[PDB]
Symmetry: C2
């Protein structure tokens, strides 16, 4: 699901309320997220059926071309993001024991984890993304920031993406304006911990 | 305290909304002032804004730089605009002949501005600069908190259009182009020309 050009929203536009308004999901998904799709079609000139999304993201902005990469990267990223949140009446809010043991090993308990995430996620300067990753080189969880359209996948340095929080101002500005931390504290309550564990 | 707004919050309507000027200026712009003080541990009296900007993030340190650059960039941003009631003024004759020299007329400049300002990916800024090395007007984009002042090669900033989404999101959402063509009517040519 997480791969693939044209991912359908796995839920309604208001299913993230009251953390992220219907208005925000509407613009984020139907404007930003779709815009990137056309954008990638226009920049490759390829038909949908010929585009391998992850392959472009790993290829990188140099080999793929800045604008092919920014588009593809943004699609992969936005894919991961919608998948990272549980709607109202979804499931996935509970931490599978497997992932839970790993997070306790890194940070002690989830409270400590949230606190490092808030620290790193508020400080990220500019347009970017926050990722929980599993570091394969080091066999441990970690929190990583990437800029613009970059990712653990495009950095291709052994870090496997588990979840992502969009930190571009378009992700929260309608709802929280300058107050990214307010957005972040509440986006935590949305995490699909199941999905995260499944990327292990 | 670097700085004060020339107009009231509503002075840029209908291009930019009172709400956007309030958040942009009172939370965003002003907020970096208290970030700068802390990151440097210095008082207002002991901080030279341009000094830290031209130092860059390696010399000044990442947070000092990001903050000082944003106070400078925003200082330029507000002064690059005039109230919509003051719109439509002639570009001073000295600036105009430089514009024509470069792009034929202003309309062709504007088209170049739209192309560059619409393509900048992520957060950043669009500047009109005098290119000392090249003896001519130019339009450039810089990323995040960077600026022609940061670059320090020889490009003098004449005006800036803020292109971070906070600049336009409440009014135009994803539609940056829409923000861009209308922002153009607000350009403070007096300021721009005065910056040569
Ligand atoms: Fe986004
Ligand atoms: Fe700004």
């Amino acid at each position: 699901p997480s791969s693939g050009l044209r991912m359908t929203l796995p839920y309604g536009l208001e299913a993230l309320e009251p953390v992220i308004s219907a208005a925000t999901v509407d613009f984020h998904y139907n404007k930003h997220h779709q815009g990137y799709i056309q954008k990638l079609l226009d920049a490759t000139g390829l038909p949908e059926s010929r585009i391998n999304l992850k392959s472009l993201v790993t290829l990188g902005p140099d080999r793929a071309g800045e604008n092919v990469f920014n588009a593809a990267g943004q699609i992969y990223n936005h894919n991961m993001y919608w998948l990272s949140m549980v709607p109202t009446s979804g499931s996935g809010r509970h931490v599978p024991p497997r992932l839970l043991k790993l997070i306790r090993a890194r940070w002690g308990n989830v409270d400590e984890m949230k606190e490092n995430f808030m620290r790193k996620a508020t400080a990220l300067f500019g347009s970017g993304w926050i990722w929980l990753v599993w570091d394969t080189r080091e066999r441990r969880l970690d929190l990583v920031g990437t800029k613009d359209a970059h990712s653990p996948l495009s950095e291709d340095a052994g870090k496997i993406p588990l979840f992502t929080c969009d930190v571009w101002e378009h992700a929260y500005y309608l709802d929280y304006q300058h107050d990214r931390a307010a957005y972040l504290t509440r986006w935590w309550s949305l995490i699909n911990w199941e999905f995260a564990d499944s990327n292990l």
